[PDB]
């Protein structure tokens, strides 16, 4: 009867086209502002002093870029970790010079993605679902907050944060290799196993369902039209695909349970990306990966090279060349 | 300096295959409206 109850009834209605919910009250204003500023800053945005040395790095399309090289540049080294909104900038020209829109996009992104995650919970509550799709979405939220939030914190500047682009991503990955040795760190190892394993069990499960489909169509029409939507009959012989994989490797390595099978597809990647995103986090605070340089010696004591020493000389090439003007002192403490 | 044959590569790489996929959808809906026998078959 009241105005608030007629507003709570609408905002929590599943009869809307897109469910809004109470998290959409701060998902939609956040992500539309992260979007509408991203499209403008990617297309039309002046160059940005990223190294704090007043050498402005172009990143937008109107200043001679493309899809690959164009990128929303991170904020300045001069700012660093300080909060830099528009009203604390004394003009928009001073805001866009010093890496303004990187903080406006990222902070409205991480609020909107952490609200998109809670929105996946909310609709599962109002639909009668068991709730935990949003726990599986915690794994890219862990990884998005690792390269945009946690790594600028432990390194003390948003300038070490990830550039919102495509070539800026590979500037981020290579400089992160030289300074932290991520490939030898066992948490990037535990998530390469998460996505190689994840793409394995995806294409391994998706093939054994498509292999054992039941005849419901003719050879002229499509294979997919043998599934009517909302039917109650099972659309594939699960005993058939169990007997196949029960002979392809051996018998006891096969899940006859389809529920425990469809749980292992959700376990393996998500655990692999939780562990990986806490690799960037523990390497944000300079707890680097393994270092086996000069580890094998002869009885005389001369250093015998290994593959890690060849990997070290690739890291030394990126270390002596990243931010080639920003350094003045012999050790990259930042 | 960019290659001026790339405009012809991209804008025909967009339009010619994308206008192809539109045609397979329009004749799909015409056959469904063709069999249905009401107000649109003719």
């Amino acid at each position: 009867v009241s105005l608030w109850e007629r507003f709570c009834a609408w905002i929590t209605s599943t009869e809307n086209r897109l469910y809004i919910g109470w998290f959409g009250c701060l998902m939609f204003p956040t992500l539309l502002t992260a979007t509408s500023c991203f499209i403008i800053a990617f297309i039309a945005a002046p160059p940005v002093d990223i190294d704090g040395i007043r050498e402005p790095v172009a990143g937008s399309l109107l200043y001679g870029n493309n899809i690959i090289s164009g990128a929303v540049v991170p904020s300045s080294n001069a700012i660093g970790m300080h909060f830099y909104p528009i009203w604390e900038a004394a003009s928009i020209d001073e805001w866009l010079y010093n890496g303004g829109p990187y903080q406006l996009i990222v902070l409205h992104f991480l609020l909107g993605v952490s609200a998109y995650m809670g929105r996946e919970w909310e609709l599962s509550y109002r639909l009668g679902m068991r709730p935990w799709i949003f726990v599986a979405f915690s794994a890219p939220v862990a990884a998005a907050s690792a390269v945009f939030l946690v790594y600028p914190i432990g390194q003390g500047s948003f300038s070490d944060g990830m550039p919102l682009g495509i070539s800026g991503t590979f500037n981020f990955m290579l400089v992160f290799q030289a300074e932290h040795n991520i490939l030898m760190h066992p948490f990037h190892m535990a998530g390469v196993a998460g996505v190689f394993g994840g793409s394995l069990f995806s294409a391994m499960h998706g093939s054994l369902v498509t292999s054992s489909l039941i005849r419901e169509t003719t050879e002229n029409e499509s294979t997919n039209y043998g599934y009517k939507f909302g039917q109650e009959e099972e659309t594939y012989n699960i005993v058939a695909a169990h007997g196949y994989f029960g002979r392809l490797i051996f018998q006891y390595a096969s899940f006859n349970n389809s529920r425990a099978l469809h749980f292992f597809l959700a376990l393996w990647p998500v655990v692999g990306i939780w562990i990986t995103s806490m690799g960037i986090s523990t390497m944000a605070f300079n707890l680097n990966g393994f270092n086996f340089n000069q580890s094998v010696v002869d009885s005389q004591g001369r250093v015998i090279n290994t593959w890690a020493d060849i990997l070290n000389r690739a890291n030394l090439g990126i270390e002596v060349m990243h931010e080639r003007n920003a350094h003045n002192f012999p050790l990259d403490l930042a | 300096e960019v290659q001026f044959g790339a405009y012809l590569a991209v804008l025909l790489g967009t339009f010619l295959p994308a206008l192809f996929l539109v045609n397979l959808f329009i004749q799909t809906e015409a056959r469904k409206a063709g069999k249905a026998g009401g107000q649109d078959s003719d």
């Binding site: 086209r17 499209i39 297309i43 399309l61 109107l62 001679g64 870029n65 493309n66 899809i67 939507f229 909302g230 | 960019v2 405009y7 991209v10 804008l11 967009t14």
Partner: peptide, 30 residues
């Protein structure tokens, strides 16, 4: 002149995302 093509590809991609969400073929039981 060159960046005009890149912008048209980007907003043209966001059009077909708009039509796929709102003008989707709504699936129906029976």
């Amino acid at each position: 002149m060159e960046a005009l093509v890149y912008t048209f590809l980007l907003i043209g991609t966001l059009m077909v995302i708009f039509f796929a969400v709102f003008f989707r073929e709504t699936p129906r039981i029976l």
